[PDB]
Amino acid sequence: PAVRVADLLQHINQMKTAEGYGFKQEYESFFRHRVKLHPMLGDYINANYIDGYHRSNHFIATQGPKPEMVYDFWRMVWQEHCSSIVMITKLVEVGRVKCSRYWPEDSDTYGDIKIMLVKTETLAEYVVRTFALERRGYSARHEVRQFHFTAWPEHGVPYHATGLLAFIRRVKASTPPDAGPIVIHCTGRTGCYIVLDVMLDMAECEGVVDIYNCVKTLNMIQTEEQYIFIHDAILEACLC
């Protein structure tokens, strides 16, 4: 069953009784949608649609493009008319490469797509990069914004949800309703973002959240600590 927002704190504390048994049990209980691209003259990148609260195919989730998949990534962004990309990692976390840079520092061409970085907006916890894409044979630029969350701890969840919730609301505010899917890419962080984005809409519209069934439909949540964090984040968002 779904949980009333006004009962969410009761629910969490019940789920914490008996040394957190409720979360542990519910988490452990967990254990066609491919984005089509036309092949070109010459595998292609594996990406899947995920439904949102208000619309089908609200997200495309992909394992962040390896260097050989960078062109297919930008082709997909182009084909799908995606204007918001979400990334929830540093490129390097504690000296280990986690994502390879798939975007130009100024300008570059990937296959038949020319990409220009036209703005960088840097904040304490995230960066917004604006790109213009030009494609051979096409007369107009396609604009894409990358929302890059940099504040996620390398060792686990954020201690406070405040910053990630601010980031999620920025992406929500910046993505116009006629947009294509939000491409979320490059651990379980992607699943947390997806579940929060959907549940924040559900709480606003219905006054209820159904995290369990949202995660079960679901990129999967990698830790019990992440499963708990999703509840703590919705709790913080549901104040006032």
Short mmCIF file of N, CA, C and O in Angstrom, two decimals, residues 71-117:
data_model
loop_
_atom_site.label_atom_id
_atom_site.label_comp_id
_atom_site.label_asym_id
_atom_site.label_seq_id
_atom_site.Cartn_x
_atom_site.Cartn_y
_atom_site.Cartn_z
N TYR A 71 29.36 9.04 -29.66
CA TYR A 71 28.55 9.49 -30.80
C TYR A 71 27.11 8.99 -30.69
O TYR A 71 26.17 9.76 -30.89
N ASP A 72 26.93 7.70 -30.40
CA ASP A 72 25.58 7.16 -30.22
C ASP A 72 24.81 7.87 -29.11
O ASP A 72 23.59 8.07 -29.22
N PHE A 73 25.50 8.25 -28.04
CA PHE A 73 24.86 9.03 -26.98
C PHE A 73 24.30 10.35 -27.50
O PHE A 73 23.13 10.67 -27.26
N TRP A 74 25.12 11.13 -28.21
CA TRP A 74 24.64 12.41 -28.72
C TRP A 74 23.62 12.26 -29.83
O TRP A 74 22.72 13.10 -29.95
N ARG A 75 23.75 11.23 -30.68
CA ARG A 75 22.67 10.90 -31.61
C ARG A 75 21.35 10.66 -30.90
O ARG A 75 20.30 11.10 -31.37
N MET A 76 21.38 9.92 -29.79
CA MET A 76 20.16 9.65 -29.04
C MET A 76 19.57 10.93 -28.47
O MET A 76 18.36 11.17 -28.55
N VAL A 77 20.41 11.76 -27.85
CA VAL A 77 19.98 13.07 -27.37
C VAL A 77 19.32 13.88 -28.48
O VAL A 77 18.26 14.49 -28.29
N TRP A 78 19.95 13.90 -29.65
CA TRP A 78 19.40 14.56 -30.84
C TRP A 78 18.06 13.96 -31.27
O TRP A 78 17.06 14.68 -31.38
N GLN A 79 18.05 12.66 -31.59
CA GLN A 79 16.82 12.01 -32.04
C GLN A 79 15.67 12.24 -31.07
O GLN A 79 14.53 12.51 -31.49
N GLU A 80 15.92 12.06 -29.78
CA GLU A 80 14.89 12.12 -28.76
C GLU A 80 14.50 13.56 -28.39
O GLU A 80 13.62 13.74 -27.55
N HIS A 81 15.17 14.57 -28.95
CA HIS A 81 14.94 15.97 -28.57
C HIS A 81 15.09 16.17 -27.06
O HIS A 81 14.32 16.88 -26.42
N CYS A 82 16.09 15.50 -26.50
CA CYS A 82 16.43 15.68 -25.09
C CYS A 82 17.10 17.03 -24.88
O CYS A 82 18.05 17.37 -25.59
N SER A 83 16.62 17.79 -23.91
CA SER A 83 17.25 19.05 -23.57
C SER A 83 17.70 19.11 -22.12
O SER A 83 18.19 20.15 -21.68
N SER A 84 17.54 18.02 -21.37
CA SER A 84 18.11 17.89 -20.03
C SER A 84 18.85 16.57 -19.86
O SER A 84 18.27 15.51 -20.09
N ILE A 85 20.14 16.65 -19.50
CA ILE A 85 20.96 15.50 -19.13
C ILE A 85 21.28 15.60 -17.65
O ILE A 85 21.61 16.69 -17.16
N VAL A 86 21.16 14.49 -16.91
CA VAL A 86 21.48 14.44 -15.49
C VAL A 86 22.63 13.46 -15.27
O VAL A 86 22.60 12.33 -15.75
N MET A 87 23.65 13.92 -14.54
CA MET A 87 24.81 13.14 -14.15
C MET A 87 25.04 13.32 -12.66
O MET A 87 24.99 14.45 -12.16
N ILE A 88 25.25 12.22 -11.92
CA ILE A 88 25.25 12.30 -10.46
C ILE A 88 26.53 11.69 -9.90
O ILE A 88 26.50 10.82 -9.02
N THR A 89 27.66 12.10 -10.47
CA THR A 89 28.96 11.60 -10.07
C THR A 89 29.98 12.69 -10.39
O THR A 89 29.76 13.49 -11.30
N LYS A 90 31.07 12.73 -9.64
CA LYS A 90 32.26 13.36 -10.20
C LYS A 90 32.85 12.45 -11.26
O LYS A 90 32.67 11.23 -11.25
N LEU A 91 33.59 13.06 -12.19
CA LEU A 91 34.36 12.26 -13.13
C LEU A 91 35.38 11.39 -12.42
O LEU A 91 35.53 10.21 -12.73
N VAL A 92 36.06 11.95 -11.42
CA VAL A 92 37.03 11.23 -10.60
C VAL A 92 36.57 11.30 -9.16
O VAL A 92 36.35 12.40 -8.62
N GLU A 93 36.39 10.14 -8.55
CA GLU A 93 36.05 10.04 -7.14
C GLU A 93 37.16 9.30 -6.41
O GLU A 93 37.49 8.17 -6.78
N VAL A 94 37.75 9.96 -5.41
CA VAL A 94 38.92 9.49 -4.65
C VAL A 94 39.96 8.87 -5.59
O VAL A 94 40.43 7.74 -5.39
N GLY A 95 40.32 9.61 -6.64
CA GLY A 95 41.34 9.23 -7.60
C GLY A 95 41.00 8.15 -8.60
O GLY A 95 41.84 7.85 -9.46
N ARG A 96 39.80 7.57 -8.55
CA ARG A 96 39.37 6.57 -9.52
C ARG A 96 38.45 7.21 -10.56
O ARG A 96 37.52 7.94 -10.21
N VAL A 97 38.70 6.90 -11.83
CA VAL A 97 37.82 7.34 -12.91
C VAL A 97 36.47 6.65 -12.76
O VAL A 97 36.38 5.42 -12.68
N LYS A 98 35.41 7.46 -12.70
CA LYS A 98 34.04 6.98 -12.62
C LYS A 98 33.24 7.26 -13.89
O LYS A 98 32.40 6.45 -14.28
N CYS A 99 33.52 8.38 -14.55
CA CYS A 99 32.97 8.77 -15.84
C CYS A 99 34.07 9.38 -16.69
O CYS A 99 34.92 10.11 -16.17
N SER A 100 34.05 9.06 -17.98
CA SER A 100 34.93 9.72 -18.92
C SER A 100 34.19 10.90 -19.54
O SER A 100 32.98 10.81 -19.80
N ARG A 101 34.90 12.00 -19.73
CA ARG A 101 34.29 13.21 -20.27
C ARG A 101 33.85 13.01 -21.72
O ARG A 101 34.69 12.79 -22.60
N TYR A 102 32.54 13.06 -21.95
CA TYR A 102 31.92 12.86 -23.26
C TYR A 102 31.54 14.16 -23.96
O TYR A 102 30.91 14.12 -25.02
N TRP A 103 31.90 15.31 -23.39
CA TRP A 103 31.52 16.63 -23.89
C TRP A 103 32.76 17.49 -24.14
O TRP A 103 33.79 17.31 -23.48
N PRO A 104 32.69 18.43 -25.08
CA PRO A 104 33.85 19.27 -25.37
C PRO A 104 34.06 20.34 -24.31
O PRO A 104 33.12 20.88 -23.73
N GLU A 105 35.34 20.65 -24.06
CA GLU A 105 35.69 21.84 -23.30
C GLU A 105 35.38 23.13 -24.05
O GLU A 105 35.12 24.16 -23.42
N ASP A 106 35.41 23.10 -25.38
CA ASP A 106 34.94 24.22 -26.19
C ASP A 106 34.05 23.69 -27.31
O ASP A 106 32.83 23.87 -27.29
N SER A 107 34.66 23.00 -28.28
CA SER A 107 33.94 22.50 -29.43
C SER A 107 34.61 21.23 -29.91
O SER A 107 35.83 21.09 -29.85
N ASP A 108 33.79 20.32 -30.44
CA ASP A 108 34.29 19.11 -31.07
C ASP A 108 33.19 18.57 -31.96
O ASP A 108 32.03 18.97 -31.86
N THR A 109 33.57 17.67 -32.86
CA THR A 109 32.63 16.96 -33.72
C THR A 109 32.67 15.47 -33.40
O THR A 109 33.75 14.87 -33.40
N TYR A 110 31.51 14.89 -33.15
CA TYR A 110 31.37 13.45 -32.98
C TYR A 110 30.53 12.95 -34.15
O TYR A 110 29.34 13.28 -34.25
N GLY A 111 31.14 12.17 -35.02
CA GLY A 111 30.50 11.77 -36.26
C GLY A 111 30.03 12.97 -37.06
O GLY A 111 30.82 13.82 -37.46
N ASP A 112 28.72 13.05 -37.27
CA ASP A 112 28.09 14.15 -37.99
C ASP A 112 27.49 15.21 -37.07
O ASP A 112 26.74 16.07 -37.54
N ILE A 113 27.78 15.16 -35.77
CA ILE A 113 27.23 16.10 -34.80
C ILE A 113 28.35 16.97 -34.26
O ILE A 113 29.31 16.46 -33.67
N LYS A 114 28.21 18.29 -34.42
CA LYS A 114 29.12 19.25 -33.80
C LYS A 114 28.50 19.76 -32.51
O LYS A 114 27.34 20.19 -32.49
N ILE A 115 29.28 19.71 -31.43
CA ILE A 115 28.85 20.12 -30.10
C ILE A 115 29.71 21.27 -29.61
O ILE A 115 30.94 21.19 -29.65
N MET A 116 29.06 22.34 -29.16
CA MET A 116 29.72 23.50 -28.57
C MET A 116 29.21 23.72 -27.16
O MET A 116 28.00 23.73 -26.92
N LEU A 117 30.14 23.88 -26.22
CA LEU A 117 29.83 24.32 -24.86
C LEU A 117 29.67 25.84 -24.83
O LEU A 117 30.65 26.58 -24.99
#
